[PDB]
Design a protein around this nucleic acid. Structure first.
Lengths: 117, 58, 103, 178, 100, 91, 116, 129
RNA sequence: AGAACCUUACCUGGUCUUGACAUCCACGGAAGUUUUCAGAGAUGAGAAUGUGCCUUCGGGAACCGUGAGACAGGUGCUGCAU
RNA sequence: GGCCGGGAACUCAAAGGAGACUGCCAGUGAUAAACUGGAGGAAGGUGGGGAUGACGUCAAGUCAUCAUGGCCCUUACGACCAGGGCUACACACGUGCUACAAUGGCGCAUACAAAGAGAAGCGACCUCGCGAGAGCAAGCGGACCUCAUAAAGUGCGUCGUAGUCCGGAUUGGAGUCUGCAACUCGACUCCAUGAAGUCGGAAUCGCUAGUAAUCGUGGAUCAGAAUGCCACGGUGAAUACGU
RNA sequence: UCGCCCCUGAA
């Protein structure tokens, strides 16, 4: 159905299709489906009048989509307001790991190009 | 380098070892260090005879 | 299988030392015990290093080592009153491990 | 520089053809040194051919491949007396290799599901010369038969010809080609 | 490594013998190593922290006859260049070059 | 913090400070060399002057710095890009 | 060490080895190959004083290849010494004189008996 | 003592007892059939063929105890184990097994990694100009 | 041949000066043991406890601290001194 | 169930031998060496792989492994400690690794390894944990026991050529372990987020067979960190007219 | 045949 998340995609198995409604990744997909007895060997184009009911029911029990996507980034911004290493480095486009900034960190700073040394 | 000094099995089963001993699991290190230390003082304090070579058997 | 009751662990690095040792003592082992067990060779416990041959740089050439540590057994079976002989009194160390026990 | 004969490979008979020729057709369809995963596609595609075409099990490959192989391959070497790269009439063994290779290459120019279905349908169009793997033939063999200056390196060779009996036209070269 | 660098490590192994006893099990299983019995107290805190340099952490292994923590071979108490030298004369017994 | 084994480190160079900062409060921002300090909610709201090998610099600790080491909330190095500081930090 | 001690009394350098090799070849050895590093006369050049007499193959695996080093520590620098004496030539010292073991040539390999 | 006819099967880290029992029966390896010890594989079918080329099971019944080494390697030692137990009967057999290369031990087998090499003959690449 | 501190030579600060590490000389104390405070520790000052080996019973021997020099230490510089 | 007796035959181990030398057959080749086929044999023609890397040249590198001539520092440039920096960073280059997929991914079940390692250790068993792992504890300095469950592979379930069921970067939160303590600067795990990339120009490099390719495994260093080095096995080619 | 130069010094 419409559900708590966004509109259902079709032509894909239930486990599959659930990952494409975000705030739900690999595990969380099949985990919900398992619990409510929903089969994940059937598609959402093969969705039934049973499975559709528990669909909306179960997704309302967890923090997912926009709501989740808010909360998470509020804590990225929490640390930024603390003046933290982990904080400030995220507005310099820099990792917080043991990851090199010498050659690597071109996910952080995007594709390499000749620019000031 | 220019000479790489091939002697690593000329003193193997072609001529005898110059320090034949055995050591067990946690003795390896100990037996190694102790032997070599003695030889330094030994060779130094003897010079009134013409040393062919020290050897030890443990 | 068949099990032995006396086991002696003769252990040295070189086969040109371990088998000099074996031949001097498995001789005496004949008259020792009520049945002979000859010397089981066992698979070698082996070590082997690779250490850099140069004081500085390089990785093209490193010194290649081996060092097989052979483990012979002398062995007897059936304890007798003359087991004392070939065990400790006729087998002594010299840079070759000698087990003074029945294991 | 090359001393003595090349290696020869002794390979197993197929469990569905008995061949070493079509064992060499499993070999071309190997990737990552796995004969296991290779053998799959082979038989999967043999069946596809048998349905979509008439043929036989030794014509689903064989005949189809005898329409992809040229009898002349043009190799490379800078010398030619015109900076030419010479035609080389290929031995019957090397004929095989060319066509076999090209059919698998042709299935990496396709995206028509599996890999069996790809090379299968390709081989079905390759026996009447209406494929796209038979058009590879039409550049190697087209070139070679439309342009020749042979394996002679014209300036070097001509001097050799002259010495032997007096010629400027093509003959065996008595003198050096160095 | 130089004499002085060596010297440091000597003193650290001195302290090892005065802080591994009952003080060994204390630093290990009793007050560390997957929680504690009931502890994790201001007790634990003082006692563990002050002998900083009796730790095997604070000790970096190196040869006693040439030093250097790099190129070290713990198992036989050897290091880089001083393996080959000895071994050639047969002064390390049974050690020989690869021939397999 | 980056990680914790099961929980945080009270620290012995912080132990002395807490016990005398409930008897006299702050009296100068607390000169602490250790950056392994992690504080209670009873020790928040103070100017903990953690070192960085360069200077002891005060951090007016908050409740979100509880269960967190205080090293991460102070400059760990000196660096600059190719820009001035009045609208950005690179320290 | 004999010729090394000689250099440390500041007498002979080149000539050192030569005397000691007419000696060594007179009785004993089957060829010697000496190496000595030139540093003589207060000259500040790296040199190699290399003299052999008789045969020293370095790769013979059926001969007693001797090898030891010494070093002087003169005021002329450091002079390395290397003496390689080819004492054997067809006779080892651990490729000869040893006892192997097994082949004991008994067709029965003893076993425990009884049945249970 | 045995009651069998033996041929030694050493190939590629797989060493094999191979015991020919007189009379027709069925090949038995480790109390299983051939295609059950080597399963449902594609590879296994290919290496069945050289054992039927030297003729298996028409006057023969066996018991085999191969262990260690590879999957293909196991089958290899069997192949070099029945050939050594077939050359015994006649020397004309011997010749027509050596010309087939299957009583000839395939000495090819993994070569050591060596220093300065990435693999067993693979080495580092250059592009350092 | 794995750089969390140490490693580590580097920096900033604390701190020592025949010395952390050596021998010898002179003095005392056998070395140590468990604990206290301050400090970031380095340390600095204690509180109790130990009297082995020899002795002429002081003294020494290992060993510890301090003093004094001759010295010691230096991954400090020259691979165009070796 | 090699699980127990029995049997040492067999494999196996690993000490010692047998063997290969153009030795033998024919041709070719000065009747010489040798070369080409042949036979016997496991193997022919330096059998394959190691060790083997000369005398030298490069005043090549290395006073920082170590040694040492001269030079310099002497309430120090020496020495010791706490903190920080080595893992900065807007970039460039070198060497690797991982993908861009159905010869594949994911789910099920299933096939067989080798060689090393180990009482600052690995740890079966049983218990709990989604997991990493933790608790309980036998065994083991050992062809004992444990690491170890080999993985690609294979038989089935699916998905269908989509930047996706491919791919996995990034970050956050929640946890784990090893440590006195894991903040810059540890690794592992869990969940979420889900990247760039649809297979790479000019150019350039390796490789002639158990090699290439690819898939795992172990080891050292190591309290605790492998896409590295070093080593071990599995599966396993294409091509070579010719210089 | 495919043009194609340029390179401080004592060991």
């Amino acid at each position: 159905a419409r559900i708590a998340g966004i509109n259902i995609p079709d032509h894909k198995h239930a486990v599959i299709a659930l990952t494409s409604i975000y705030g739900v990744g690999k595990t969380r997909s099949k985990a919900i489906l398992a619990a409510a007895g929903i089969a994940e060997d059937v598609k959402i184009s093969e969705l039934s009048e049973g499975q559709i009911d528990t669909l909306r029911d179960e997704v309302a029990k967890f923090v997912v989509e926009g709501d989740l996507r808010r909360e998470i980034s509020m804590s990225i911004k929490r640390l930024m307001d603390l003046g933290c290493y982990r904080g400030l480095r995220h507005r310099r486009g820099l990792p917080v790991r043991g990851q090199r900034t010498k050659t690597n960190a071109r996910t952080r700073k995007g594709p390499r190009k000749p620019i000031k040394k | 380098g220019q000479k790489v000094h091939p002697n690593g099995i000329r003193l193997g089963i072609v001529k005898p070892w110059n320090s034949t001993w055995f050591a067990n699991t946690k003795e390896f290190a100990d037996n190694l260090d102790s032997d070599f230390k003695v030889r330094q003082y030994l060779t130094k304090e003897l010079a009134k005879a013409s040393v062919s070579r020290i050897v030890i058997e443990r | 299988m068949q099990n032995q009751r006396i086991r002696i662990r003769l252990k040295a690095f070189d086969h040109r030392l371990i088998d000099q040792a074996t031949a001097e003592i498995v001789e005496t082992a004949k008259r020792t015990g009520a049945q002979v067990r000859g010397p089981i060779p066992l698979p070698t416990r082996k070590e082997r290093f690779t250490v850099l041959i140069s004081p500085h740089v390089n990785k093209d050439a490193r010194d290649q080592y081996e060092i097989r540590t052979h483990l012979r057994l002398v062995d007897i079976v059936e304890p007798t009153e003359k087991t004392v002989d070939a065990l400790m009194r006729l087998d002594l160390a010299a840079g070759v491990d000698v087990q003074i026990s029945l294991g | 520089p090359r001393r003595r004969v090349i290696g020869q490979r002794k390979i197993l008979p197929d469990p569905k053809f008995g061949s070493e020729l079509l064992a060499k057709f499993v070999n071309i369809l190997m990737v990552d040194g796995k004969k296991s995963t290779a053998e799959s596609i082979v038989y999967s595609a043999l069946e596809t051919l048998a349905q979509r075409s008439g043929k036989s099990e030794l014509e689903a490959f064989e005949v189809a491949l005898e329409n992809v192989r040229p009898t002349v391959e043009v190799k490379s070497r800078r010398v030619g007396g015109s900076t030419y790269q010479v035609p080389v009439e290929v031995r019957p063994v090397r004929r095989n290799a060319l066509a076999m290779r090209w059919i698998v290459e042709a299935a990496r120019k396709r995206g028509d599901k599996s890999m069996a279905l790809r090379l299968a349908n390709e081989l079905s169009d390759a026996a009447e010369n209406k494929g796209t793997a038979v058009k590879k033939r039409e550049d190697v063999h087209r070139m070679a038969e439309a342009n020749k200056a042979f394996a002679h390196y014209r300036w070097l060779s001509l001097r050799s010809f002259s010495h032997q009996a007096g010629a400027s036209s093509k003959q065996p070269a008595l003198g050096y080609l160095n | 490594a130089k004499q002085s660098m060596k010297a440091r490590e000597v003193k650290r192994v001195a302290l090892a013998d005065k802080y591994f006893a009952k003080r060994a099990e204390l630093k290990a299983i009793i007050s560390d190593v997957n929680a504690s019995d009931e502890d994790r107290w201001n007790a634990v805190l003082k006692l563990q922290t002050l002998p900083r340099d009796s730790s095997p952490s604070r000790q970096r292994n190196r040869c006693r006859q040439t030093g250097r923590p790099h190129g070290f071979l713990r198992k036989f108490g050897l290091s880089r260049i001083k393996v080959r030298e000895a071994a050639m004369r047969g002064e390390i017994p049974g050690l020989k070059k690869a021939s397999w | 913090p980056r990680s914790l084994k099961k929980g945080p480190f009270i620290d012995l160079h912080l132990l002395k400070k807490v016990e005398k900062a409930v008897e006299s409060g702050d009296k100068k921002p607390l000169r602490t060399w250790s950056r392994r300090s992690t504080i209670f909610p009873n020790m928040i709201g103070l100017t903990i002057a953690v070192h960085n090998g360069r200077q002891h610099v005060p951090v007016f600790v908050t409740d979100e710095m509880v269960g967190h080491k205080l090293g991460e909330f102070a400059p760990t190095r000196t660096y600059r890009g190719h820009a001035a500081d009045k609208k950005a930090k690179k320290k | 060490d004999s010729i090394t001690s000689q250099l440390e009394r500041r007498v002979m350098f080149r000539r050192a080895m030569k005397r000691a090799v007419q000696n060594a070849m007179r009785l004993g050895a089957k060829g010697i190959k000496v190496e000595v590093s030139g540093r003589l006369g207060g000259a500040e050049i790296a040199r190699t004083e290399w003299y052999r007499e008789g045969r020293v193959p370095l790769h013979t695996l059926r001969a007693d290849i001797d090898y030891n080093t010494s070093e002087a520590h003169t005021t002329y620098g450091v002079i390395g010494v290397k003496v390689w004496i080819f004492k054997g030539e067809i006779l080892g010292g651990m490729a000869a004189v040893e006892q192997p073991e097994k082949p004991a040539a008994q067709p029965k390999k003893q076993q425990r008996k009884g049945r249970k | 003592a045995e009651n069998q006819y033996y041929g030694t099967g050493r190939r590629k880290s797989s060493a094999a007892r191979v015991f020919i029992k007189p009379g027709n029966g069925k090949i038995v390896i480790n109390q299983r059939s051939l295609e059950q010890y080597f399963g449902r594989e594609t590879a296994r079918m290919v290496v069945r063929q050289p054992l039927e080329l030297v003729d298996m099971v028409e006057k023969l019944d066996l018991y085999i105890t191969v262990k260690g080494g590879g999957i293909s390697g196991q089958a290899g030692a069997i192949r070099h184990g029945i050939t050594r137990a077939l050359m015994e009967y006649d020397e004309s057999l011997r010749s027509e097994l050596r010309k087939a290369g299957f009583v000839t031990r395939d000495a090819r087998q993994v070569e050591r990694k060596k220093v300065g090499l990435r693999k067993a003959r693979r080495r580092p690449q250059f592009s350092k100009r």
